[PDB]
Design a protein around this ligand. Structure first.
Ligand SMILES: Cc1cn([C@H]2C[C@H](O)[C@@H](COP(=O)(O)OP(=O)(O)O[C@@H]3C[C@H](N)C(=O)[C@@H](C)O3)O2)c(=O)[nH]c1=O
Ligand SMILES: Nc1ncnc2c1ncn2[C@@H]1O[C@H](CSCC[C@H](N)C(=O)O)[C@@H](O)[C@H]1O
Ligand SMILES: [Zn+2]
Length: 405
């Protein structure tokens, strides 16, 4: 019976995805078939409604020198972050000597636009290989985790930040109270801490269980974020839904009572209450839907094999580790996975050990089917792979249901 990392309440489990490997560890084929594994299960705190995993993976096992995800590998995301940076430069970063700190800046996808605007900034990026990619672009980066002590150190030497921003990173951090204390130490009194992460309501609506894996400790909602803010001295003052990464919300927190919440905050809270989003029964219904997607996906993949059809995967997502390991999908059913990330290529996916090959290798003669693990990138990918579909190749999707098109 684990304690909520937000409030210390009791977390009741509703979904057990079993034994899983580290999602972003890609092994060379000659490596020992030994892997770290942990139990992936999700529950909901009884007191603040925060949905969260019940076993933490230690941060240094996930985030370190060879972390492989490079944010800038998607054109949609590069545009998405450039626009956000422009929005901040026009609103929160006006005035003299503004300062923005990004938590989890990766390869500098967002902070490049800030640096090109001449605005003082600091990225925190504890994964040193992508940190170096950002530094190559002229971005100032500390290769450290953001937490209370490193935030204090930055406030000491650099002064208060007008904006603290985190995308697809807050939800990865079980030590969220320490981060919030770091934000309290570092943020200007009239500043904002803005984060965007996969949204519980989209996960439940689309049965997108592959959004649950080691790096995604929290599945935030407006309800839980509002409670988390309030308990830590802040206030949820804006929310915006975003289509990226399968559906997100961007949450804006301010010091309590410094700004009046937008109507959007109340409207999203009322819709979550109306739709019973975080009620344990709704969350168990989702868990039941997850098993149905497993069973239909494996039935399909086995029928394809019996029918002599070839099947590959597209995108060696961290997400797909949950899919292949919960569903038991290995190279006998999905022969290769195609991906543009050099440090994932010529390696095997975690747990299931499917070989990953460069996306340039996905070409005539094409396979019959491609299981689309990077389904959040469907539009971008399929635009680049029209020749596959024109040839008669078909995509297998498992969100929001198993279907082929
Ligand atoms: C856009 C695109 C991606 N890809 C590959 C790149 C990358 O390995 C994968 C896409 O991964 P993506 O869905 O962005 O992210 P992911 O599920 O691996 O998760 C990672 C780790 C992290 N914890 C997280 O939350 C998100 C931001 O990024 O697909 C590709 O081969 N062709 C393409 O056109
Ligand atoms: N405490 C912490 N502080 C800052 N970055 C962190 C962190 N824990 C993990 N990370 C970084 O968080 C990132 C998550 S991936 C998200 C990268 C990027 N913001 C994007 O949206 O695409 C990784 O690069 C990881 O190294
Ligand atoms: Zn709680």
């Amino acid at each position: 019976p684990t304690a909520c990392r937000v409030c210390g309440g009791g977390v009741q489990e509703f979904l057990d995805l079993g034994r899983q490997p580290l999602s972003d560890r890609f092994r060379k084929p000659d490596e020992l078939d030994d892997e770290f594994t942990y139990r992936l299960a999700v529950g909901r705190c009884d007191s603040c409604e925060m949905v969260q995993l019940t076993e933490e993976v230690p941060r240094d096992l996930m985030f370190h020198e060879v972390y492989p995800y490079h944010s800038s590998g998607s054109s949609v995301m590069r545009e998405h972050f450039a626009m956000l940076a422009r929005d901040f430069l026009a609103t929160e970063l006006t005035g003299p000597d503004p300062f923005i700190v990004e938590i989890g800046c990766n390869d500098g996808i967002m902070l490049r636009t800030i640096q090109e605007a001449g605005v003082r900034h600091l990225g925190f990026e504890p994964s040193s290989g992508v940190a170096a990619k950002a530094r190559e672009k002229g971005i100032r980066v500390r290769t450290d985790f953001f937490e209370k002590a490193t935030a204090d150190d930055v406030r000491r030497t650099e002064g208060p930040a007008n904006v603290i921003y985190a995308a697809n990173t807050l939800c990865h951090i079980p030590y969220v109270q320490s981060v919030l204390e770091g934000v309290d130490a570092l943020l200007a009194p009239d500043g904002v801490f803005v984060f965007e992460d996969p949204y519980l309501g989209d996960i439940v609506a689309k049965t997108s269980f592959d959004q649950i894996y080691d790096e995604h400790f929290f599945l935030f909602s407006a309800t839980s974020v509002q409670g988390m803010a309030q308990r830590c001295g802040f206030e949820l003052v804006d929310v915006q839904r975003l289509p990226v990464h399968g559906g997100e919300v961007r949450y804006t927190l301010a010091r309590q009572g410094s700004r009046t919440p937008s109507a959007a905050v109340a409207q999203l809270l009322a819709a979550e209450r109306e739709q019973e989003l975080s009620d344990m029964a709704t969350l168990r219904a989702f868990a039941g839907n997850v098993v149905k997607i497993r069973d239909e996906l494996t039935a399909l993949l086995h029928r394809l094999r019996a029918e002599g059809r070839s099947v590959v995967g597209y995108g060696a997502t961290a997400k797909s580790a949950t899919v292949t390991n919960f569903c038991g999908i290995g190279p006998d059913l999905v022969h290769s996975v195609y991906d543009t990330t050099p440090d994932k290529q010529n390696r095997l996916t975690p747990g299931a050990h499917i070989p990953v090959r460069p996306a340039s290798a996905f070409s005539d003669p094409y396979p019959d089917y491609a299981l689309l693990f990077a389904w959040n990138h469907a539009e971008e990918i399929m635009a680049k792979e029209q020749e596959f579909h024109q040839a008669g190749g078909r995509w297998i999707l498992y969100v929001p249901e198993v279907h082929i098109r």
